[PDB]
Design a protein around this ligand. Structure first.
Ligand code: 0DF
Ligand code: MG
Length: 202
């Protein structure tokens, strides 16, 4: 099977580009399992709700980080590892890169703390490829106003999230493809068409 993750803000066309990529796989042999984090199983989605619902009790950062990883542990067991087991391609909206970006970059938790949970929860399992939908934050912020606890975050939070994805990509370039989601969809999908050979390769 193949484990592909998609990262970036929702105003970035992630969803429509995921559908584009899923169509290209299904018109070939390929089983596609679409999924998203936090969530993807009934229990993971209950955890999602705790994470996204605003509250008058401020959630501790260590709490947010641990809930993200709890949902991930359930999701890996309920959905991701089985998919991969039967040779499917998983197209997962957000994964541990998002933890580095939102909880590490956004919240300022130490990368070491995130890296330690990543190893505990996932073992050696990492995405085979990660698509970063990169977008200047003003566009991201406009699109969020036009459209939860994260949507309501400030400018400096979102700047940290964007640049953390870009740093993560730069450190392990064989695992990432950065896409300029400020381009019109046609040129973004052209870019996806260009990755498909490699993706089918893996
Ligand atoms: C999967 N994931 C994570 O590990 N850390 C995360 N922080 C924020 C989001 C998220 C979820 C919904 C809307 C916006 C951001 C998702 C995250
Ligand atoms: Mg804040």
């Amino acid at each position: 099977g193949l484990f592909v993750t998609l990262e970036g803000p929702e105003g970035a066309g992630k969803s429509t580009n995921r559908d584009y990529l899923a169509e290209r796989l299904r018109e070939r042999g390929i089983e596609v399992q679409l999924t998203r984090e936090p969530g993807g199983t009934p229990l993971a989605e209950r955890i999602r709700e705790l994470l996204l619902a605003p509250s008058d009790e401020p959630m501790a950062a260590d709490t947010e980080l641990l809930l993200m990883f709890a949902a991930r542990a359930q999701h890996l067991a309920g959905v991701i590892r089985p998919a991969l087991a039967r040779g499917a391609v998983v197209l997962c909206d957000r994964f541990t890169d998002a933890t580095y970006a939102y909880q590490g970059g956004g919240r300022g938790l130490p990368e070491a703390r995130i890296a330690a949970l990543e190893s505990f929860v996932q073992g050696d399992l990492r995405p085979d490829l990660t698509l970063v939908f990169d977008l200047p934050v003003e566009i991201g912020l406009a699109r969020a106003a036009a459209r939860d606890r994260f949507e309501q975050e400030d400018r400096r939070f979102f700047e940290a999230v964007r640049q953390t994805y870009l740093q993560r990509a730069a450190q392990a370039p064989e695992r990432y493809q950065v896409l300029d989601a400020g381009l019109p969809l046609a040129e973004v999908q052209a870019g996806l068409d260009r990755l498909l050979p490699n993706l089918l390769e893996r």
